[PDB]
Design a protein around this nucleic acid. Structure first.
Ligand SMILES: [Mg+2]
Ligand SMILES: [Mg+2]
Ligand SMILES: [Mg+2]
Ligand SMILES: [Mg+2]
Ligand SMILES: [Mg+2]
Ligand SMILES: [Mg+2]
Ligand SMILES: [Mg+2]
Ligand SMILES: [Mg+2]
Ligand SMILES: [Mg+2]
Ligand SMILES: [Mg+2]
Ligand SMILES: [Mg+2]
Ligand SMILES: [Mg+2]
Ligand SMILES: [Mg+2]
Ligand SMILES: [Mg+2]
Ligand SMILES: [Mg+2]
Ligand SMILES: [Mg+2]
Ligand SMILES: [Mg+2]
Ligand SMILES: [Mg+2]
Ligand SMILES: [Mg+2]
Ligand SMILES: [Mg+2]
Ligand SMILES: [Mg+2]
Ligand SMILES: [Mg+2]
Ligand SMILES: [Mg+2]
Ligand SMILES: [Mg+2]
Ligand SMILES: [Mg+2]
Ligand SMILES: [Mg+2]
Ligand SMILES: [Mg+2]
Ligand SMILES: [Mg+2]
Ligand SMILES: [Mg+2]
Ligand SMILES: [Mg+2]
Ligand SMILES: [Mg+2]
Ligand SMILES: [Mg+2]
Ligand SMILES: [Mg+2]
Ligand SMILES: [Mg+2]
Ligand SMILES: [Mg+2]
Ligand SMILES: [Mg+2]
Ligand SMILES: [Mg+2]
Ligand SMILES: [Mg+2]
Ligand SMILES: [Mg+2]
Ligand SMILES: [Mg+2]
Ligand SMILES: [Mg+2]
Ligand SMILES: [Mg+2]
Ligand SMILES: [Mg+2]
Ligand SMILES: [Mg+2]
Ligand SMILES: [Mg+2]
Ligand SMILES: [Mg+2]
Ligand SMILES: [Mg+2]
Ligand SMILES: [Mg+2]
Ligand SMILES: [Mg+2]
Ligand SMILES: [Mg+2]
Ligand SMILES: [Mg+2]
Ligand SMILES: [Mg+2]
Ligand SMILES: [Mg+2]
Ligand SMILES: [Mg+2]
Ligand SMILES: [Mg+2]
Ligand SMILES: [Mg+2]
Ligand SMILES: [Mg+2]
Ligand SMILES: [Mg+2]
Ligand SMILES: [Mg+2]
Ligand SMILES: [Mg+2]
Ligand SMILES: [Mg+2]
Ligand SMILES: [Mg+2]
Ligand SMILES: [Mg+2]
Ligand SMILES: [Mg+2]
Ligand SMILES: [Mg+2]
Ligand SMILES: [Mg+2]
Ligand SMILES: [Mg+2]
Ligand SMILES: [Mg+2]
Ligand SMILES: [Mg+2]
Ligand SMILES: [Mg+2]
Ligand SMILES: [Mg+2]
Lengths: 193, 148, 126, 207
RNA sequence: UUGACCUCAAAUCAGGUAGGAGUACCCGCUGAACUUAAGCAUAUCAAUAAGCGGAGGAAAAGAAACCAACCGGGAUUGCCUUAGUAACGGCGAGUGAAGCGGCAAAAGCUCAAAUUUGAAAUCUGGUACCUUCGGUGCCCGAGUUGUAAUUUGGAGAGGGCAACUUUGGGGCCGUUCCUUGUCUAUGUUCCUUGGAACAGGACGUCAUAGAGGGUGAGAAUCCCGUGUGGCGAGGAGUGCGGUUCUUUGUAAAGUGCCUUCGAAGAGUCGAGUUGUUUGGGAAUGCAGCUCUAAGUGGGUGGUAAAUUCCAUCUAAAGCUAAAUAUUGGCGAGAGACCGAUAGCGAACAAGUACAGUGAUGGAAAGAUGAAAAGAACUUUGAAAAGAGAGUGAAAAAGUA
RNA sequence: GACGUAAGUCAAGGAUGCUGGCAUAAUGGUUAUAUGCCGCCCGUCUUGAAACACGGACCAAGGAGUCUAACGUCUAUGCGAGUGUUUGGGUGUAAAACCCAUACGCGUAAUGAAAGUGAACGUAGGUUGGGGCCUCGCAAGAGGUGCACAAUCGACCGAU
RNA sequence: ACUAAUCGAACCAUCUAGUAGCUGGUUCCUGCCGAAGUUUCCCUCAGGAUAGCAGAAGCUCGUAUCAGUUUUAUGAGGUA
RNA sequence: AAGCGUGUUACCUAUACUCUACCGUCAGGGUUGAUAUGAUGCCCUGACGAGUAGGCAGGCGUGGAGGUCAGUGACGAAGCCUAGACCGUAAGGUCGGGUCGAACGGCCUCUAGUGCAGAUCUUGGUGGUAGUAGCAAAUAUUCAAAUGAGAACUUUGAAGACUGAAGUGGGGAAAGGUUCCACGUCAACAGCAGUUGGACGUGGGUUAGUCGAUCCUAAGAGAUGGGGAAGCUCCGUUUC
RNA sequence: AACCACAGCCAAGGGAACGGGCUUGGCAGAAUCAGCGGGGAAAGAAGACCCUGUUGAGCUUGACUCUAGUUUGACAUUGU
């Protein structure tokens, strides 16, 4: 029934919704179990650091490409540039992604610097050596944090060339909007006589 | 809590505040938005004009991220410089040392022109700007650098 | 207070465990303290009660009465002592059920296993 | 089951109440009204040496509490132990008793376990300071015993006029009135020189 | 005549395997109506209930014929969110995702397409002997209508030249996991009430133990326990010590450059049409029928079509832990929950007694006392029983 | 206020003075009864119920506006151009309490179907009121300023 | 007609607490305020929405703006 | 006239009017350098009080929760009874006395499965009706003895009757399941009674080569081969 | 056992327009038994007639919308 001045609602409760009500009573319990799972895995794989070294990538879309983040794995080009094989890299804790490609020199250099820097700060115990204890460090990510690069300097000189940035945006829109028609008129004008 | 509700006060009174004559029933006018064009027309035309009917174009597979463009006005432009370092630029207002404000890293797509910044030159890096916003920045002695 | 996650503080569970305790559990449940002299002699505080043990009643209406356990009647969590009885009106005599926590052991019926239990608990056994 | 059980409180407002309850611990009138036997306590806030943090045994911890003046509040607990007055007594809530002192340390070097068994006594790290223990039953003025390291650390934890709080972006709340002695403000010569003379405080009946 | 081969049979042939149960969660199929729309048919309820088939400790999904359009991400799942939004809809009622972003957890891979052809190098089985979750030899068989090695698109192969660097198994004991045992404080001191002290009062003690329970009334200190550590037993299986097997290898793997190559899944993709389904709208998936491909090819790029590009993946074959689920099972810990007409139907010989031909339906029913100490004995009565007496703190507790 | 020259007094902004009996069932309360007068059976639908309208033989126990998702107004509280710790992580005396990064949501911008564009002529305007404040006045009042708010004419952004 | 005391579609269980604009009921006390059965629309006429009547919260101000009233002046009306 | 018309006075009595008090509500005020510490306090002044549906406000009561009263309690908690008492307009609260036997309150707060006369309400218990309607079909009983506490009803004898061989007789089939028989025995059951009993308690009892089943086929039912069906399964009975 | 708000004398009045109760009169004396059918608008059942409901169902048909079956065509089976 429709009554006095109230916003129109859309409460989707016209199925047997009470049969699929999940109440996360176990939030604290699952937290205890997750920390217990982390401690168990830490002991099982000690002295390894509980997570793989991830690369830094750009985020997709125009909404998020201003930021960098952790990616899945280093590309085969990055691993080869860092001086090691993908198969060996996977056994010393480096994530390797065969489907990501390098087209950005800045990101590629950053990941290769990331790989050499990681190599400098790990100890690979020999397969039949003495294997000394090396104070297990739980987080590789906290050891090698992802840094947003520097876009510019804090201050510099005003260079005004009279370009009218707004005019530039307008003209960019117009040239793109009229490229197809102008090429069509160019092609027909060329073909006429 | 239950003890502060009118149910407690209605105890002993027969109709529970629902009336003897009207006699609270199940769904006397229909359920949900029933009758919005028939017996709820007046309410719907008075409080929700435009509710029924169609409007312009459809957009199949619309991703909002294509349209991400948070606006920032000039009157808030100087807030992107931290307060500790702000007053140093506000004084000694000159070129050859002008604050670069990267409004994109600040999370903004377009700089609008609500206006009245100080007369200090600033280098505004933005994806988009309104025509008046670029006028006021240039008038102050700054510049807008188009970035992507 | 409680510290471990394996032990319960739930009253209903505790009482259920008590009243459904099997006989071998009830043997431990029916422990009695030793007398001052027996504590000094052996070095142990309390032992599970047994048949030929000599006991002194130290609570209730039969306080100060001595005797020997004629029965550890585990089915109702009690022990019966000879010389401690109720004389019914029809001349008959019936045992008084006693709880061993209200008893004091004044002499032990010692065999190999009782001696080993004392030594296990840290007893002098002399 | 999907009845609302937990209640979200604004984090700043939780801190607001915690600070108000810490401040109320220093007001002997509030602590007396709340029910603690601090009538013979030499001074409130009660601060004791940091050696309390390293006391290992319950007996030594109890003796230190009695020495610093918590004996009556300890005896009030375990003299107040009562059987609960209804069905709660067979839902594992059999007994009731008063709260004793709350000992606040900075480093648990044995004090927590030494006081675990003392009836009515609680312990807390300065870093946490539960409101449920500082104002039990929503009643302000819990009898608190601070160790010296705990008292000193409290400026770093909650901030001061010269020290920023360790809590990110937090500052202690501001008073909306400069004092609580409205009588003394009224009696100030400034207001006294602006007010008209007063009547009788009980008007004489006419007609 | 005989000996194969193919195909098809028989045997109480040798050895195995499936069925049925449970089913809370999981993978599918099939599939409603009540209901809402203030009527009603599309719609909604709902791709739900019921019905059928199949699993496990999880299942399924899963290492892109993905998302994207960015300066690009990068298996799957789940959470926060996107978002009650794009979209669908008698555009009514209603319905309704996904990409990005932050998190939990992270793990990668395997076949088919290739001549071993200087050697079927491969495997089940029988048998004998052993160090028996198997090994070795011998034999029969399977298999060239293709079993091994070698490659899986990230590649990789053949050849040519360079060279260097790293390797396996196996006991005991160790830890580690599970199951379980045992040991490890302190009053039963005096006074009062009481049937009973576990109550109140006094004086103490232990406390990493003042959780809980029992004991003749509220028991840290009477008992079991609790807390804290110690010492054992049976058993799991990976990092640990250490001990040997020490041509234990010209055996395997990796790495650079050059050259030539680089096989990559068909009644399938795709299309038309019908039905169903989806937010998917000139058609989201699925399924039937008809048509039916290619190899700088093929799919996708959320408005049908032609022409031109571009981007992005590589289907029609396959395996994989964790984060997720769990009104069933087993083992535990709990509660501002109910307190015998409540709480499960069932606190009890409860899915019992009982009803119905049957499918099914399905209750009621807890409390003497601390202890039967459950009333000896006398007397009236044919007896039940009464009156006495007696037990008990109390019979104003007598199993009615 | 009155009276009196004054003392002081008075019937003048609400009772004092004198005296007696009893100190208990005596007054009073409770209860049963009697007497006078009055009083139809509740609940419910209904214009209208004591109704020849319905439910109700009696008693005990049970017995009906709840919780949840999303939301409107109002109110309290915290912070404030911000705000929200609790998805998750850290930590714990362990479902508590305490601490926290990156995001995300809502707000800080609107408007158009959309492509898009996007907020100061001015002391962020003028006029009429406008509480409070200021100046002058014994005061009344007069003059200056005038936040919120109200009416109104403009200016700016988008659509046309 | 009969199909297990059941037949103009048996019985059992579930969907299912099926929907009901209709009938019945809807549990303490006191205090203050205090109605409507009319307008418009509706497959509307035993129902709703809407406005009105009502309460509550107040807020901006502080004797104004006013007024179910008259007087004066000035209109209008076509009933007796 | 105690009737009708009319006139005059006196008189009667409403929860209305005047005055006074008390309650509450609203309004307007007073009160701080001791308001001679209650400032949501105290006090002054005026007016007002009907009420269904309904709104709001302040309170009363119940189960559980945090805190406090170092509250009460086996020398008696709670519960229940009490034409005994007191406080509150009221919801209610308190006290005494009896019964009783183990727990329970006051205050500040939190929370709800939180208050009953009704629902042809649910479950259970109980009345009036009422010692009432009734216990009247099947022709019918009687005498004596025995037994027994007790005999219309048991047993025995005597007698009078009836079923009248398509039986109230002698066996069986379905069904029941020990009811059969003996001893003991009468609280319940046998709508009176009961010493009797198909009742209660404890026992005893069913013997087959030939009687039946078992074998046969009947109308039918139904595997297999095989074909349908997503499938549960269906078809079919000698078929390919 | 039905039944039972409480109950049980009338007349008239008014009253929801036929009262056991209310108003005015009549009157009115414990406790009861057999019978009786005037009254209790006696009991038996949420009128089965009628109307209303945006409540059904059985049945009918040129109602609306479909559907098993069946018929017709094309494609496939489908070759020489
Ligand atoms: Mg009312
Ligand atoms: Mg009603
Ligand atoms: Mg109670
Ligand atoms: Mg599935
Ligand atoms: Mg409908
Ligand atoms: Mg409807
Ligand atoms: Mg219908
Ligand atoms: Mg659907
Ligand atoms: Mg199902
Ligand atoms: Mg299994
Ligand atoms: Mg798992
Ligand atoms: Mg799989
Ligand atoms: Mg691949
Ligand atoms: Mg992914
Ligand atoms: Mg959003
Ligand atoms: Mg569609
Ligand atoms: Mg749907
Ligand atoms: Mg190889
Ligand atoms: Mg006890
Ligand atoms: Mg004691
Ligand atoms: Mg202990
Ligand atoms: Mg392929
Ligand atoms: Mg389907
Ligand atoms: Mg569909
Ligand atoms: Mg890509
Ligand atoms: Mg029950
Ligand atoms: Mg008694
Ligand atoms: Mg009694
Ligand atoms: Mg008794
Ligand atoms: Mg009297
Ligand atoms: Mg009367
Ligand atoms: Mg009527
Ligand atoms: Mg009535
Ligand atoms: Mg009716
Ligand atoms: Mg009735
Ligand atoms: Mg009834
Ligand atoms: Mg009740
Ligand atoms: Mg129903
Ligand atoms: Mg009024
Ligand atoms: Mg219409
Ligand atoms: Mg009606
Ligand atoms: Mg005329
Ligand atoms: Mg006219
Ligand atoms: Mg006259
Ligand atoms: Mg009133
Ligand atoms: Mg309570
Ligand atoms: Mg009592
Ligand atoms: Mg009474
Ligand atoms: Mg008792
Ligand atoms: Mg209730
Ligand atoms: Mg009742
Ligand atoms: Mg009522
Ligand atoms: Mg009779
Ligand atoms: Mg004859
Ligand atoms: Mg005859
Ligand atoms: Mg016979
Ligand atoms: Mg028998
Ligand atoms: Mg009889
Ligand atoms: Mg008899
Ligand atoms: Mg006999
Ligand atoms: Mg017989
Ligand atoms: Mg009644
Ligand atoms: Mg009556
Ligand atoms: Mg009548
Ligand atoms: Mg009357
Ligand atoms: Mg009369
Ligand atoms: Mg009659
Ligand atoms: Mg009817
Ligand atoms: Mg009917
Ligand atoms: Mg209608
Ligand atoms: Mg019909």
């Amino acid at each position: 029934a429709i009554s006095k001045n109230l916003p129109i609602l859309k409460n989707h409760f016209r199925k047997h919704w009470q049969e699929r009500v999940k109440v996360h009573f176990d939030q604290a319990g699952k937290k205890v179990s997750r920390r217990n799972a982390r401690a168990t895995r830490a002991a099982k794989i000690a002295p390894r650091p509980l997570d793989l070294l991830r690369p830094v990538v750009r985020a997709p879309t125009v909404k998020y490409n201003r930021k960098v983040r952790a990616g899945r794995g280093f590309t085969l080009a990055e691993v080869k540039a860092a001086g090691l094989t993908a198969a060996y890299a996977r056994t010393i804790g480096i994530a390797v992604d065969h489907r990501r490609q390098n087209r950005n020199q800045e990101i590629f250099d950053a990941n290769v610097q990331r790989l050499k820097e990681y190599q400098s700060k790990i100890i690979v115990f020999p397969r039949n050596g003495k294997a000394p204890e090396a104070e297990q460090v739980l987080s590789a990510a906290a050891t090698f944090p992802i840094a947003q690069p520097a876009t510019d300097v804090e201050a510099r000189a005003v260079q005004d060339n009279g370009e009218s940035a707004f005019r530039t945006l307008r003209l960019a829109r117009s040239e793109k909007k009229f490229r197809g028609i102008r090429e069509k008129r160019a092609r027909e004008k060329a073909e006429a006589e | 809590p239950s003890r502060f509700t009118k149910t407690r006060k209605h105890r002993g009174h027969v109709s529970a505040g629902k009336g003897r004559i009207g006699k609270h029933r199940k769904h006397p006018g229909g359920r949900g938005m029933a009758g919005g064009q028939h017996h709820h027309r007046i309410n719907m035309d008075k409080y929700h004009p435009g509710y029924f009917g169609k409007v312009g174009m459809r957009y199949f597979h619309k991703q909002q991220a294509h349209f991400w463009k948070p606006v920032l006005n000039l009157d808030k432009l100087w807030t992107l410089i931290p307060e500790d370092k702000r007053d140093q630029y506000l004084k000694s207002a000159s070129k050859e040392t002008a604050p670069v404000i990267d409004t994109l890293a600040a999370g903004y797509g377009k700089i609008l022109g609500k206006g009245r910044i100080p007369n200090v030159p600033v280098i505004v890096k933005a994806r988009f700007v309104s025509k008046l916003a670029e006028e006021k920045i240039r008038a102050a002695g700054g510049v807008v650098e188009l970035i992507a | 207070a409680k510290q471990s996650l394996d032990v319960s503080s739930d009253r209903r569970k505790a009482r259920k465990a008590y009243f459904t305790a099997p006989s071998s559990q009830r043997r431990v449940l029916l422990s009695a303290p030793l007398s001052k002299e027996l504590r000094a002699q052996y070095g142990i505080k309390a032992l599970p009660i047994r048949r030929d043990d000599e006991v002194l009643v130290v609570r209730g209406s039969k306080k100060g009465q001595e005797g020997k356990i004629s029965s550890v009647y585990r089915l109702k969590f009690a022990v019966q002592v000879d010389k401690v009885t109720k004389e019914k009106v029809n001349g008959a005599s019936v045992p008084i059920n006693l709880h061993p926590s209200k008893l004091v052991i004044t002499k032990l019926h010692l065999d190999k296993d009782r001696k080993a239990l004392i030594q296990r608990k840290g007893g002098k056994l002399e | 089951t999907w009845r609302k059980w937990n209640v979200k409180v604004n984090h700043n407002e939780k801190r607001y109440a915690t600070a108000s309850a810490i401040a109320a611990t220093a007001v002997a009138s509030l602590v007396l009204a709340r029910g603690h036997r601090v009538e013979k306590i030499p001074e409130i806030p009660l601060v004791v040496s940091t050696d309390l943090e390293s006391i290992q045994k319950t007996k030594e911890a109890v003796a230190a509490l009695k020495a610093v003046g918590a004996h009556s509040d300890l005896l009030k607990v375990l003299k107040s132990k009562k059987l609960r007055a209804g069905k709660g007594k067979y839902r594992n809530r059999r007994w009731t008793q008063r709260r004793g002192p709350l000992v606040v340390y900075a480093e648990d070097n044995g004090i927590v376990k030494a006081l675990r068994n003392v009836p009515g006594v609680e312990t807390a790290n300065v870093a946490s300071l539960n409101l449920l223990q500082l104002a039990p039953g929503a009643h302000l003025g819990r009898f608190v015993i601070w160790t010296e390291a705990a008292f000193t650390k409290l400026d770093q934890v909650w901030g001061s006029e010269t020290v920023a709080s360790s809590k990110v972006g937090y500052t202690l709340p501001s008073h909306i009135i400069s004092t609580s002695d409205v009588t003394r403000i009224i009696n100030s010569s400034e207001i006294q020189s602006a007010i008209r003379p007063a009547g009788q405080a009980t008007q004489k009946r006419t007609h």
